[PDB]
Amino acid sequence: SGSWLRDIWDWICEVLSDFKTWLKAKLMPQL
């Protein structure tokens, strides 16, 4: 047994910050 639920929680924290940068990177046109 272990803390699999918590393991995904921390992983989502990185994806949450990444999603914010991913949206800005995709919205940024060729410059």
UniProtKB/Swiss-Prot annotation:
Record's comment on post-translational modification: Cleaved by host caspases which are probably activated by the viral infection. Ubiquitinated. Ubiquitination by host TRIM22 leads to interruption of viral replication.
Places the protein is found: Host endoplasmic reticulum membrane; Host cytoplasm, Host perinuclear region; Host mitochondrion; Host cytoplasm
Bilayer disposition of the protein: Peripheral membrane protein
Intramembrane region residues: 1-31
Top-level taxon: Viruses
Stretches for region Membrane-binding: 6-26
Record comment regarding domains: The N-terminus acts as a membrane anchor. The C-terminus contains a nuclear localization signal.
Function of the protein: Phosphorylated protein that is indispensable for viral replication and assembly. Both hypo- and hyperphosphorylated states are required for the viral life cycle. The hyperphosphorylated form of NS5A is an inhibitor of viral replication. Involved in RNA-binding and especially in binding to the viral genome. Zinc is essential for RNA-binding. Participates in the viral particle production as a result of its interaction with the viral mature core protein. Its interaction with host VAPB may target the viral replication complex to vesicles. Down-regulates viral IRES translation initiation.
Record's subunit section: Monomer. Homodimer; dimerization is required for RNA-binding. Interacts with the mature core protein. Interacts (via N-terminus) with non-structural protein 4A. Interacts with non-structural protein 4B. Interacts (via region D2) with RNA-directed RNA polymerase. Part of the viral assembly initiation complex composed of NS2, E1, E2, NS3, NS4A, NS5A and the mature core protein. Part of the replication complex composed of NS2, NS3, NS4A, NS4B, NS5A and the RNA-directed RNA polymerase embedded in an ER-derived membranous web. Interacts with host GRB2. Interacts with host BIN1.
Extra facts: Cell culture adaptation of the virus leads to mutations in NS5A, reducing its inhibitory effect on replication.
Protein name according to UniProt: Non-structural protein 5A
Organism name: Hepatitis C virus genotype 1a (isolate H77)
Taxon lineage: Viruses, Riboviria, Orthornavirae, Kitrinoviricota, Flasuviricetes
